[PDB]
Design an enzyme around this catalytic site. Sequence first.
Site, mmCIF file in Angstrom:
data_model
loop_
_atom_site.group_PDB
_atom_site.id
_atom_site.type_symbol
_atom_site.label_atom_id
_atom_site.label_comp_id
_atom_site.label_asym_id
_atom_site.label_seq_id
_atom_site.Cartn_x
_atom_site.Cartn_y
_atom_site.Cartn_z
ATOM 1 N N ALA A 223 33.918 49.498 46.757
ATOM 2 C CA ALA A 223 34.314 48.186 47.267
ATOM 3 C C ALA A 223 33.882 47.105 46.259
ATOM 4 C CB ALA A 223 33.747 47.980 48.668
ATOM 5 N N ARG A 224 32.739 46.476 46.517
ATOM 6 C CA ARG A 224 32.063 45.596 45.562
ATOM 7 C C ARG A 224 30.585 45.901 45.634
ATOM 8 N NH1 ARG A 224 36.317 45.023 43.533
ATOM 9 N NH2 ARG A 224 37.415 43.057 43.087
ATOM 10 N N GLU A 253 28.130 44.032 36.482
ATOM 11 C CA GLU A 253 28.953 44.923 35.680
ATOM 12 C C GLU A 253 29.176 44.344 34.300
ATOM 13 O OE1 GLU A 253 32.560 45.911 37.862
ATOM 14 O OE2 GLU A 253 31.361 46.391 39.630
ATOM 15 N N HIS A 272 33.722 51.194 37.205
ATOM 16 C CA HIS A 272 34.760 50.411 37.906
ATOM 17 C C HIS A 272 36.169 50.855 37.514
ATOM 18 C CE1 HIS A 272 35.609 46.321 40.015
ATOM 19 N NE2 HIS A 272 36.576 47.179 40.252
HETATM 20 N N1 LIG Z 1 36.769 49.855 42.827
HETATM 21 C C1 LIG Z 1 37.980 49.362 42.541
HETATM 22 O O1 LIG Z 1 38.567 49.535 41.481
HETATM 23 C C2 LIG Z 1 38.676 48.625 43.630
HETATM 24 C C3 LIG Z 1 40.066 48.642 43.728
HETATM 25 C C4 LIG Z 1 40.688 47.968 44.775
HETATM 26 C C5 LIG Z 1 39.910 47.323 45.711
HETATM 27 N N2 LIG Z 1 38.558 47.286 45.567
HETATM 28 C C6 LIG Z 1 37.748 46.561 46.547
HETATM 29 O O2 LIG Z 1 38.055 47.069 47.822
HETATM 30 C C7 LIG Z 1 38.342 46.009 48.747
HETATM 31 C C8 LIG Z 1 39.322 46.448 49.821
HETATM 32 O O3 LIG Z 1 40.587 46.685 49.179
HETATM 33 P P1 LIG Z 1 41.839 47.115 50.071
HETATM 34 O O4 LIG Z 1 43.008 47.099 49.139
HETATM 35 O O5 LIG Z 1 41.544 48.312 50.899
HETATM 36 O O6 LIG Z 1 41.888 45.818 51.022
HETATM 37 P P2 LIG Z 1 42.590 45.779 52.475
HETATM 38 O O7 LIG Z 1 42.641 44.334 52.871
HETATM 39 O O8 LIG Z 1 43.804 46.664 52.503
HETATM 40 O O9 LIG Z 1 41.542 46.491 53.431
HETATM 41 C C9 LIG Z 1 40.254 45.976 53.681
HETATM 42 C C10 LIG Z 1 39.946 46.263 55.124
HETATM 43 O O10 LIG Z 1 38.571 45.940 55.397
HETATM 44 C C11 LIG Z 1 38.628 45.296 56.674
HETATM 45 N N3 LIG Z 1 37.336 44.605 56.915
HETATM 46 C C12 LIG Z 1 37.057 43.326 56.629
HETATM 47 N N4 LIG Z 1 35.792 43.061 56.999
HETATM 48 C C13 LIG Z 1 35.232 44.150 57.530
HETATM 49 C C14 LIG Z 1 33.939 44.538 58.118
HETATM 50 N N5 LIG Z 1 32.949 43.625 58.208
HETATM 51 N N6 LIG Z 1 33.769 45.822 58.543
HETATM 52 C C15 LIG Z 1 34.765 46.732 58.441
HETATM 53 N N7 LIG Z 1 35.981 46.424 57.946
HETATM 54 C C16 LIG Z 1 36.267 45.184 57.477
HETATM 55 C C17 LIG Z 1 39.905 44.443 56.618
HETATM 56 O O11 LIG Z 1 40.352 44.032 57.911
HETATM 57 C C18 LIG Z 1 40.877 45.381 55.963
HETATM 58 O O12 LIG Z 1 41.611 46.188 56.881
HETATM 59 C C19 LIG Z 1 38.848 44.862 47.873
HETATM 60 O O13 LIG Z 1 38.622 43.615 48.533
HETATM 61 C C20 LIG Z 1 38.040 45.064 46.619
HETATM 62 O O14 LIG Z 1 36.792 44.374 46.726
HETATM 63 C C21 LIG Z 1 37.933 47.935 44.573
#
Ligand SMILES: NC(=O)c1ccc[n+]([C@@H]2O[C@H](COP(=O)([O-])OP(=O)(O)OC[C@H]3O[C@@H](n4cnc5c(N)ncnc54)[C@H](O)[C@@H]3O)[C@@H](O)[C@H]2O)c1
Lengths: 306, 306
Positions: A223-224, A253, A272
Site C-alpha cells: 500500500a504505502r 524510499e 516499490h
Molecule cells: N505498491 C505499488 O506499486 C502500488 C500500486 C498501486 C497502488 N498502491 C497503493 O495501494 C492503494 C490502493 O490502490 P487500489 O488501486 O486498490 O485503490 P482502490 O481505491 O481500488 O481500493 C482501495 C480500497 O481501500 C478502501 N479503504 C479505504 N480506507 C480504508 C480503511 N480504513 N480500511 C479498509 N479499507 C479502506 C477503499 O474504500 C477502497 O475500496 C493506493 O492508494 C496506493 O497507495 C501501491
Amino acid sequence: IERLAVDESVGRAMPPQRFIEALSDLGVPVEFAGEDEQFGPGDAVASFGHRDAFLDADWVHCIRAGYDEFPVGVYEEAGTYLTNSTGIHGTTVGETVAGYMLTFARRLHAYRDAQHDHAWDLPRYEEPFTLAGERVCVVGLGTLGRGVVDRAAALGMEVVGVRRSGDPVDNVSTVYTPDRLHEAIADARFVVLATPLTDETEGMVAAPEFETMREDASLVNVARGPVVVESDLVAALDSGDIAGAALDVFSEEPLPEDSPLWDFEDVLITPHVSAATSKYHEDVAALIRENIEKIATGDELTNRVV
Amino acid sequence: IERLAVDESVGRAMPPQRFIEALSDLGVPVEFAGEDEQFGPGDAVASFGHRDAFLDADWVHCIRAGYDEFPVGVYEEAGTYLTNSTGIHGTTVGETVAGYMLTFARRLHAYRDAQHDHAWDLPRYEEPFTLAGERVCVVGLGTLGRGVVDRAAALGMEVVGVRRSGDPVDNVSTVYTPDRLHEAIADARFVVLATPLTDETEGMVAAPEFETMREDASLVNVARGPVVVESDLVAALDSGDIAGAALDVFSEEPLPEDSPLWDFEDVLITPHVSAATSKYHEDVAALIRENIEKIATGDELTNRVV
Ligand SMILES: NC(=O)c1ccc[n+]([C@@H]2O[C@H](COP(=O)([O-])OP(=O)(O)OC[C@H]3O[C@@H](n4cnc5c(N)ncnc54)[C@H](O)[C@@H]3O)[C@@H](O)[C@H]2O)c1
Ligand SMILES: NC(=O)c1ccc[n+]([C@@H]2O[C@H](COP(=O)([O-])OP(=O)(O)OC[C@H]3O[C@@H](n4cnc5c(N)ncnc54)[C@H](O)[C@@H]3O)[C@@H](O)[C@H]2O)c1
Ligand SMILES: [Mg+2]
Ligand SMILES: [Mg+2]
Ligand SMILES: [Mg+2]
Ligand SMILES: [Mg+2]
Ligand SMILES: [Mg+2]
Ligand SMILES: [Mg+2]
Ligand SMILES: [Mg+2]
Ligand SMILES: [Mg+2]
Ligand SMILES: [Mg+2]
Ligand SMILES: [Mg+2]
Ligand SMILES: [Mg+2]
Ligand SMILES: [Mg+2]
Ligand SMILES: [Mg+2]
C-alpha cells in the site's frame, strides 16, 4: 481536450516514448513535456508527480493509483480535473503478493540465500507449508485487494478482509469493518495491506496489531509505507511478535541502507515494484483512451479525485 | 500383514517418530527398523529406498512418488508387493512451481539478491511481466503435472501439455504426444517437467530442446534430474539458448558445490523440497491405511508397481 502532454516524470514508471507511441491513434496529438512547460485551456497532462504549472490545464491524469502526494484542494479551487490510475494494478500486485506468500510457504527465499553459498540446506521439517487451507486477511478490498483475494482464493486459501462498509466481497468469506481490524487479523497467517494512505489509515498497523497477530504470521505491505509504523515493525520482528514481512513500500524510499529491515531473513524487500510491468504503458494508455471518450461524449471522468 | 516396519531411511523425508506416531492404531504394531533388520512373512515395510532384506517381506511401501531406484524385476521374482506414494504431492509441488513462475515473472529472486546488498536496484522496464496471458507447457500430466496445470490456469496462463495418450486434460488447452514435444515447447514461456524417470524419459530434454525453446523461456524440473541432460542445460544457460531454470532435482544429489548451476542468476536451485510439507507424515500414513485395507479385503493395491 486538444492535446495530451506527457510529463517527463512518467519516466519514473515507464519510458515516455513507449507511452507516447501507445497513444498514437488517440484522436488528439500526444507530446513529450519537459519539467519547465506552461499549460493552458484544452491541455490534458499525464504525470507521475504534481507541478503547479498543471493548474492552468483542464485535466491532469496521475499515472499512479495513489494520489496522496497531490494537493487535491488546490486542484478543486483552480478548476482542474484530477484523475488517478486505480483499477490497473490488480493483476501485477495480485501476482506479486501470491509470489510473496508462496515464497514464505515454500521457503524459496531461504533456498535463494543458500544458493549464494552453494549450500544444500534442508529446511526444518515444520517450516514448509501449503497456502491451501491457510488464512489470509486482506485490508482494503479495492483493485489491489481484490487482485490478492482472487488469487489467494484460487490457491485454496481461506480469505477474510476489511473494508469501509463491511459489506460482502466476491471471494471473501468474512468481511469486517475497520473497527474490527484486530478480530480480522488475529487468526491470519498473512495480513495484506492494500488501503490508500489517508488520515484514517496512517499508522494503522503498529505494535498493538503485531501483538494481536499470530507469531507465525507475516505482514505484506503493498500500500504505502506509513500505513505501518515502521519502527514498531522492526521491534516486532526482533521480538518475534510476528514471523516476517514482505514489504514493497516504505516510509522513506529508497529504503535507507541503514534500515534494519534489510537484514531479517524472513523479510522480503522489493523496491516499490509489486505493480511493475513491461506493459504499463498500455495499461495507463487504456485509461487515457477511456477518459478521452468520456470527455468527447460529456460523461463523468473515470477515477476522478477532484 | 502382522507388522509395519518403518525403515530408518524415512528420516530422509520426515522425522521417523512423527511418522510412527501417525501410524498408531493400524491394527498391527508399528516398529522402527534399522539398516540390519531382517524381515519375514507378515511384514510390511515403509521405506525411502530399497534394501535387499525387504525381499523377505510381504509388502514394501515406498514413501516417495518416484520408484526408479527400486529393482522392480527383483520384487516380482521374490513375490514382494511394491507400492509408491504418487497422488499426495500435487498441492505442494503445484504451489512450489507456481512460486517459481511468479518468482521469475515478478523478479523476486533478483530483489532477494539485492536485499543482501541493501541495494535498491530497479529492474529494467522489460523485465517484469505477468503470468496472466503467458504460456506454460507441462510435460507429464499426472499428480504433479495436474497440480501445476490447475494453478497455472487459475492464474490466467495459457496451458499446454505433453502426454502419451494425447487425451485431453482439464485446464489444458492443447495436449501433444511426445513425438510433438518440440511443437509443445516452442512457444512456451515455461516448460515444466513432471514425468517419472524411465528408460523413455531419461535424457528427454537436451540440446535440441533448448534450441527449440524461446530464449526468454525457463525450464522447471521437479521430476528427476536425468530427465534433462544436465551438461546440455549448463551449455544452454551459458549460451542464452534459454533464459533460466527452476531446478529441484539433479543428476547427483546433493548437488555438488562446484556445479555450474548454482551461479546463474536466473536459475533457482531448491534442494529436492518442492514437495516438502510439515504434514508429510499424515499424508503418507493415509496411503498406508488405505493399502492395509486393500490387503485386508483382497482388493488391488493403490499405486502398485509390481
Ligand atoms: N505498491 C505499488 O506499486 C502500488 C500500486 C498501486 C497502488 N498502491 C497503493 O495501494 C492503494 C490502493 O490502490 P487500489 O488501486 O486498490 O485503490 P482502490 O481505491 O481500488 O481500493 C482501495 C480500497 O481501500 C478502501 N479503504 C479505504 N480506507 C480504508 C480503511 N480504513 N480500511 C479498509 N479499507 C479502506 C477503499 O474504500 C477502497 O475500496 C493506493 O492508494 C496506493 O497507495 C501501491
Ligand atoms: N521433486 C519432488 O519432490 C518430487 C515429488 C514427487 C514426484 N516427483 C517426481 O515426479 C514424478 C511424477 O510424479 P507424479 O506423482 O506426478 O506421478 P504420476 O504417476 O501421478 O504421474 C506421472 C505422469 O507421467 C506420465 N508419463 C509417464 N511416462 C511418460 C512419458 N514417457 N511421456 C509423457 N508422460 C509420461 C504418466 O502417464 C503420468 O500421467 C515421480 O515419478 C518422481 O520422479 C518429484
Ligand atoms: Mg532457518
Ligand atoms: Mg495448507
Ligand atoms: Mg491500532
Ligand atoms: Mg503477535
Ligand atoms: Mg522466526
Ligand atoms: Mg539484471
Ligand atoms: Mg502477462
Ligand atoms: Mg487428479
Ligand atoms: Mg529430443
Ligand atoms: Mg532456444
Ligand atoms: Mg541430469
Ligand atoms: Mg539471455
Ligand atoms: Mg556462485
